[PDB]
Structure formats: structure tokens, C-alpha cells
Swiss-Prot record, chain D:
Protein name: Transient receptor potential cation channel subfamily V member 1
Residue ranges of ANK repeats: 1-15, 50-72
Domain comment, as recorded: The association domain (AD) is necessary for self-association.
Family: Belongs to the transient receptor (TC 1.A.4) family. TrpV subfamily. TRPV1 sub-subfamily.
Record organism: Rattus norvegicus (Rat)
Parent-protein start and end of this portion: 344 to 423 of 838
Tissue: Predominantly expressed in trigeminal and dorsal root sensory ganglia. Expressed also in hippocampus, cortex, cerebellum, olfactory bulb, mesencephalon and hindbrain. High expression in the cell bodies and dendrites of neurons in the hippocampus and in the cortex. In the brain detected also in astrocytes and pericytes (at protein level). Isoform 1 and isoform 3 are expressed in brain and peripheral blood mononuclear cells.
Gene field: Trpv1
Length: 536, 79, 80, 80
């Protein structure tokens, strides 16, 4: 085809689609180009149009459709064998395509894992010196990195625990068994491109996901990742986390002390008196502003490094947004302070409040507290927002009714009546707060209707809905806790402030000692003991 | 019977308008009681804003659940 | 969690208040605590400037603690 | 309110010569696992008198499954 929609499609592609082994054999026999790239729009992702992306190549097409016989033929035909390492216009190989077509369903994932395995075996058999799994597409992603980024948990789970029991394919494995006693045996996970690598370490890809990856909560449950994160935590990060928490606590105490003893004279900035208390006060103020600047620049670092696309900028990393807002309030307070405006106080208190509230960020890393904080966040985003919309509609409607009814009274104003009706919500509503009206029956009927709708119905409904929510987000909260542990571990090991290399764990062990050549393979493996009472 | 077991929003908007018209009649009738009518319409008007929560997936469900809570649980409880 | 919130907003409010009857961490802490037991005054002082800031802080505290946290506690106990 | 019968009819597909024209669901193209089907929509969107959507929506509230019938695939996608 020459049209842009089916561009590049030929007889071989059609033969593969129809699953006709005979026609494929004849076409290859007749000199068909096994590398003919079908790169029309119909064979691209292109979400706004129909299509089917399969890597544009006949080998990739056979692999994606669970046609193993055609794959073996295309790789090992006499007339024109296919290039196993060929790449499409995106740079994707067959393995990248197999990652792409994954969707974590049992039937899809089963054959996707099996075909991926078979391709690896064949690639070893035809090209022992070729390392397919290191090839990157135009995005720099290996098949493992692509699977981790796209959330294809099934494929990732297969790869990370890949063990191949046959001669001359042992080196492809990533899970090894070093020694075995009876029910107990000690396995080794490879951890290359998991712990640390050039660009797309799997932990870094998962933790810094865009929050729209399907299974980002579940991917860290995979055995080697969870054990590695726990090891990093216990060995290196736990004490540092506690230290950071302690330092933040000291910072908040200092900020509180500095703000509490602010002077009450007008027109800042204030002349420093030659007395001990004021030297300590100004010192605390300087430390507070310093911390504000620190968190400000960390926030900018976050935004630039992650480049959230204006929706990921808010729906996730809620904590960094809040810390950044605290720093903004601190800096605006500084500007107003040196601007000779009293309004700096109005900024400072907000920062102070935010600071103490942001203490809850450090609840994560405790299994029980972090779930609590996670549920707070999710409730604020969903249920409190919906409730506040409805409640404010009722509040404003009945406030307007009551303030209209009242005439030439103390209240007689939208603010006062809104406040006085709000007092019903907190269990302080007077219910006789004024007599400056006519038609007392109308007044009392309005208040009773408001009370029944808001206090009795809506608040109790809110409690019921929050119960329904927690019943559904308990397990999601558990996985989110694990996710944050992963995130803090990565940030701690990447910042590290001291060029300390002990964070690199698991030790340089020898896996096989016999690569495709005579060399020996050292792969920094991570040891995991297991016990099993079957398969003696 | 279908007039009352279903189509509550039509009832509520119609009743609001009835309160408004009664307010007009009282207003030109030289009775201060028009205020008593007007405020009721005003209150109902704002609550009828919830009618428009349909067309939003998140809020529409919430409005439906409020409707069902009123019709079942609040009615039983208030009795 | 509640004590974190209470202390944070008490510190903010007592910072905002100046040369008033309350003007002290203990009294303001107690006064904000009164909201939890359904006795919060919500206009317990005028010894400040920036009425908008003070009332905003009190409303935010009320919503965060009284509305969200207590009902959330009920939900968590129900799960337990 | 006979949801089962309606659910059958609206996605009815007949695979034989001289009875294709009775079908209301068609498959235009099917490439790999992906295939583009077509729903007939005669007298669902608009009809002489009793369009299916009009009948369901303006039902008398005593129909059994009036809430559930819009879960039938072509209707839900059409309404969206
Ligand atoms: C979500 C946005 C960014 C938000 C930021 C500020 C302005 C905030 O007001 C809100 C608006 C608001 C205020 C009061 C009631 C409802 C909503 O809610 C939060 C935000 C509301 C919060 C919620 O408290 C928390 O987020 C604790 C927390 C939970 C999980 C986290 O990962 C976390 O990271 C630090 C912090 C506290 C305030 O920051 C706060 O203490 C002050 C004085 C106002 C609250 O805006
Ligand atoms: C003095 C002031 C008092 C205010 C009193 C009123 C408070 C609520 C006001 C909120 C307004 C919402 C609204 O306008 O109506 C809502 C809520 O109704 C009520 O709860 C009134 C309680 C009486 C649902 O109305 P809806 O039109 O969707 O009815 C549905 C049909 O359409 C649909 O086909 C189904 O058959 C479905 O079973 C039907 O329900």
C-alpha cells in the first residue's frame, strides 16, 4: 500500500494476519521482504483513531498474535531469515512490542510471557553474543524499563523471576538457586537495572510513575522489589529518615518559638534590642527563613525533574505541593516584613499552620499511621469536597432566606447570618438568635428545615459515606504505604549529601561463571532464602 | 400516583414557582406576607441547584444518594 | 493526628492574637479544643487585626478536625 | 421492562446467507484481536412514535427494570 493509512502493508503481513502458514511459507520462498515495515497510520497507537500497533514488522506481528510457528519460521527460514534485533520507527524490537500488547489479563499475559521466553531462547540459539534485553527504543527504554513504566505487572513479574532450566540458556535467567538443603534453599535475584543503572532503574521508573500507570501500587509487591526495599530501609534509610523527621521537628519548634514571641509594635522591620531574648528571636527567624528557602528550592527541583503535565502536577505528589505552599507563605511573609507591612503576620501564621500539618507527611513509613494519613488525603479530595459543595449550597440558600426575612436587626447581613447558621453544624446553633422579624413561624420553619437537611441528614450521611470509602480503600492504602517507602528510599539514596557508596547493596556474587564465552558473570545479586515442604 | 412517587424535581421547581407567584399576588395585594412567601421560594431555589448535579458523574450519584436517604432513612427516623 | 492539628492551629491563632485576654498557648489550645466537644465559641476574641485571617483559620480548623477527623475516626472504628 | 429480550435484540447477529439482513449488529472489519462492530440504531435514536430511549426514559415508573435497561451496550454508548 502507498496510502498513508495502510502504508507498508504487503502480502506477508496479510498472510500472517490470516494465520495461513502455507501462504507465509510461499511468500518468503518467493522473496518477500521479511523486514518490510508496515508504518501506516492504521498500524500506530493513535488513540484518536482506530488501529493496531504491533511494531510494524512481520516477526513482531507473529509474536503479538501467538503464532509461534511463524516466528520460528521467520527467524530460521532458508531464503531470508528475519533480523531478531530489528527496530521499528519508534525503535521498538519484538520484545518491546510484546511488552506493549500486555494488559495484565491471564490469557494475554500467559502467552505474552511464554512468547517472550521463547524469543529469548531462540535469540540465544542464533546470536549468543546478542543481548536483546539491553536494546532501547527511541525513549531509551529497555523491555524491562518499558514494562515497569507502563505498569505491565504480569510481564514484569515474569522477567524479575525468570529462571531457565536448560544448558546454554542458564545465562538468560535472573533468578538462580545457589545452594539447596532439603525444604530450604537460597535463591539469588540478579538486580541489574533494578537497584541502579544509567537512566531507567526499575525502582526509579515505578516510584516516579505519572500516577496513571495501572498497577503502580501493585508492582512493588513483586518479591525481589519488596525485599530489596525492606533491606534498603533497614540498613541505610531508616536511621536517616528518623533523623530527617527529628530535624524537621526541631525546625517547627524553632519556627513556633520565633513566631510566638514576635514584637507587637507597628511598622516592621523591628530594631534589634541588645538583650538575650531578642538575639534568640532573630536567630530563630533566620533559621525559619532558611528552612523556607530550602523547601522552596526543593519544590522547584521536584517540578523540573519530574515535569508533571499540569494534571499529574496536582493529582499526585500532594505532599510536595503542600510543602511548596508552606515555603511560598514563608517567602511572602519575608517580603511583606521587609516591605514595612504588618500583613506579613497574616502570611506567617498560615505557613506555621501548614508546617505543623505537614508533620503528617512523616507518618508514612509507619504501617499503621501512614494508612491513616493516606485515607485523610483521599477523603479530602473526594468526599469532603462533594460534601462541602452540597453543604455550602444549603447553607447559602437558607442564609439568604433568613437574612431576607430579618429586617433592621443586629444580624441583618449575609456574613452574620451565614456564621450563625454555621454554628448549627458545630453543635452551637442558638435557634432563637434574633426576634427582629415578622412571621416567627416562617423563621422557625426555615431553621428547622435547615437543621434537618444539614445537621441530621447530611452529616450522618457523610459519616456513612466515609465508612463506605474506608471499607474500599484499606488495601489500596496498604500498597500506597509501600509505595511511599520506595519513594523515600530512592530520594534518600539519590540525595545522600556525602558521596556514600555503602547504599549499593547485595554484594557482587558470581552467578554461573560460564557466559556464552569462557568469561564469568558477576551481577550484584540479592539473596533470598525460602522454605518449601513439597517437591522434595 | 406517578405524579408523586416519581419526578420530584418537576414538583420542586413547580412549587418554587408557585411560591413566587403567591408572593407576587400578596405583594400587589398590599400584604406584607409576600415576604413569607418569597423567602420560601428563595430557599427552595437554592436547594434546587442540586438538580444540576446530574451531568457530573461524581456529584450526580451524590445527589441521588441524598434523594434516597431522604425518602427512606430520614422519613423513618423523623417519624 | 488530632494533637498535631490542634497544636498547629493553636500556635497559629495565638501568634495572631496580641495583647488579649487569651494571648497564651494554654488558653488558646483549650479554646480550640472546645470545638471538638461541641462548645466552640467561634468568636471568642476580637483582640487582633485581620478578622479574615482569624476566621479563616478557625473555619479551616473546624472543617479539618470536627468534620473530617471525627467522622473518619468513626469510620475507622467501624472497620476495626 | 423485558430487559432480556431487548438485550438480545439490540445486539442480534445472524451468520448465514439470506439472513444477514435481519441482524442488527455487524462486524465491518476485524484485523487482529481488534474489530469494529456496527449497531443498527433503527428506532433507538428516533422513530415514528416509540423510540426505545423515549419509551424507557418516559416509562411510568412501574416498569420493573427501567433503571437497568440503559445498561444495554449500544444504548449506554449512544447516550454518552
Ligand atoms: C489541598 C490544598 C493544597 C490545601 C492546602 C492548604 C491551604 C490547606 O487548605 C486546603 C483547602 C482547605 C482548607 C480547609 C478545609 C478544606 C480544604 O486544603 C489543603 C490544605 C489542607 C490541609 C490538609 O492537611 C494535610 O494535608 C495533612 C497531610 C496529609 C498527607 C500528606 O501526604 C501531607 O503532606 C504534607 C500532608 C492542611 C492545610 O494545609 C493547613 O494546615 C492550612 C492552614 C490550610 C490547609 O488547600
Ligand atoms: C423548604 C425547602 C425544603 C427542601 C426539600 C428538598 C430537599 C432536596 C432538594 C434537592 C433537589 C433535588 C431534586 O430536585 O430532586 C431529587 C431529589 O428529590 C427529593 O429527594 C425530594 C424529596 C422530598 C431527585 O429528583 P428526580 O427528578 O431526579 O426524581 C427521580 C426521577 O427523575 C427518576 O426518573 C427516578 O424515578 C428516581 O427514582 C426519581 O427520584
Amino acid at each position: 500500500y502507498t496510502d498513508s493509512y495502510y502504508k507498508g502493508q504487503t502480502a506477508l503481513h496479510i498472510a500472517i494476519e490470516r494465520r495461513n502458514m502455507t501462504l507465509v511459507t510461499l511468500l518468503v520462498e518467493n522473496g518477500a521482504d521479511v523486514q518490510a515495515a508496515a508504518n501506516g497510520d492504521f498500524f500506530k497507537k493513535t488513540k484518536g483513531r482506530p488501529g493496531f500497533y504491533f511494531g510494524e514488522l512481520p516477526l513482531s506481528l507473529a509474536a503479538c498474535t501467538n503464532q509461534l510457528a511463524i516466528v520460528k519460521f521467520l527467524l530460521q527460514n532458508s531464503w531470508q531469515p528475519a533480523d531478531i534485533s530489528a527496530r521499528d520507527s519508534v525503535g521498538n524490537t519484538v520484545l518491546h512490542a510484546l511488552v506493549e500488547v500486555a494488559d495484565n489479563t491471564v490469557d494475554n499475559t500467559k502467552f505474552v510471557t511464554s512468547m517472550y521466553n521463547e524469543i529469548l531462547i531462540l535469540g540465544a540459539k542464533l546470536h549468543p553474543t546478542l543481548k536483546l534485553e539491553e536494546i532501547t527504543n527511541r525513549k531509551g527504554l529497555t523491555p524491562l524499563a518499558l514494562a515497569a513504566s507502563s505498569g505491565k505487572i504480569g510481564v514484569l513479574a515474569y522477567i524479575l523471576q525468570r529462571e531457565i532450566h536448560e544448558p546454554e540458556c542458564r545465562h538468560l535467567s535472573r533468578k538462580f538457586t545457589e545452594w539447596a538443603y532439603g525444604p530450604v534453599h537460597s535463591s539469588l535475584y540478579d538486580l541489574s537495572c533494578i537497584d541502579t543503572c544509567e537512566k531507567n532503574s526499575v525502582l526509579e521508573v515505578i516510584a516516579y510513575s505519572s500516577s496513571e500507570t495501572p498497577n503502580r501500587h501493585d508492582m512493588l509487591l513483586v518479591e525481589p522489589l519488596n525485599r530489596l526495599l525492606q533491606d534498603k530501609w533497614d540498613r541505610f534509610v531508616k536511621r536517616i529518615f528518623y533523623f530527617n523527621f527529628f530535624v524537621y521537628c526541631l525546625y517547627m519548634i524553632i519556627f513556633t518559638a520565633a513566631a510566638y514571641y514576635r514584637p507587637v509594635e507597628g511598622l516592621p522591620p523591628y530594631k534589634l534590642k541588645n538583650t538575650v531574648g531578642d538575639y534568640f528571636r532573630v536567630t530563630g527567624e533566620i533559621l525559619s527563613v532558611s528552612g523556607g528557602v530550602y523547601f522552596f528550592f526543593r519544590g522547584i527541583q521536584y517540578f523540573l525533574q519530574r515535569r508533571p503535565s499540569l494534571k499529574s502536577l496536582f493529582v499526585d505528589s500532594y505532599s510536595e505541593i503542600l510543602f511548596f505552599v508552606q515555603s511560598l507563605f514563608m517567602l511572602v511573609s519575608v517580603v511583606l516584613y521587609f516591605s514595612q507591612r504588618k500583613e506579613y503576620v497574616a502570611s506567617m501564621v498560615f505557613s506555621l499552620a501548614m508546617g505543623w500539618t505537614n508533620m503528617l507527611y512523616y507518618t508514612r513509613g509507619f504501617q499503621q499511621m501512614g494508612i491513616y494519613a493516606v485515607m485523610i488525603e483521599k477523603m479530602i479530595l473526594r468526599d469532603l469536597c462533594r460534601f462541602m459543595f452540597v453543604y455550602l449550597v444549603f447553607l447559602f440558600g437558607f442564609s439568604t432566606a433568613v437574612v431576607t426575612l430579618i429586617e433592621d436587626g443586629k444580624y441583618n447581613s449575609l456574613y452574620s447570618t451565614c456564621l450563625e447558621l454555621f454554628k448549627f453544624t458545630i453543635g452551637m446553633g442558638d435557634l432563637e438568635f434574633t426576634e427582629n422579624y415578622d412571621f416567627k413561624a416562617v423563621f422557625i420553619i426555615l431553621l428547622l428545615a435547615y437543621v434537618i437537611l444539614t445537621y441530621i441528614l447530611l452529616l450522618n450521611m457523610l459519616i456513612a459515606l466515609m465508612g463506605e470509602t474506608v471499607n474500599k480503600i484499606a488495601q489500596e492504602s496498604k500498597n500506597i504505604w509501600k509505595l511511599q517507602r520506595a519513594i523515600t528510599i530512592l530520594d534518600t539514596e539519590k540525595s545522600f549529601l556525602k558521596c556514600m557508596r555503602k547504599a549499593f547493596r547485595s554484594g557482587k556474587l558470581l552467578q554461573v561463571g560460564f557466559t556464552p564465552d569462557g568469561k564469568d558473570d558477576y551481577r550484584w545479586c540479592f539473596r533470598v532464602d525460602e522454605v518449601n515442604w513439597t517437591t522434595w
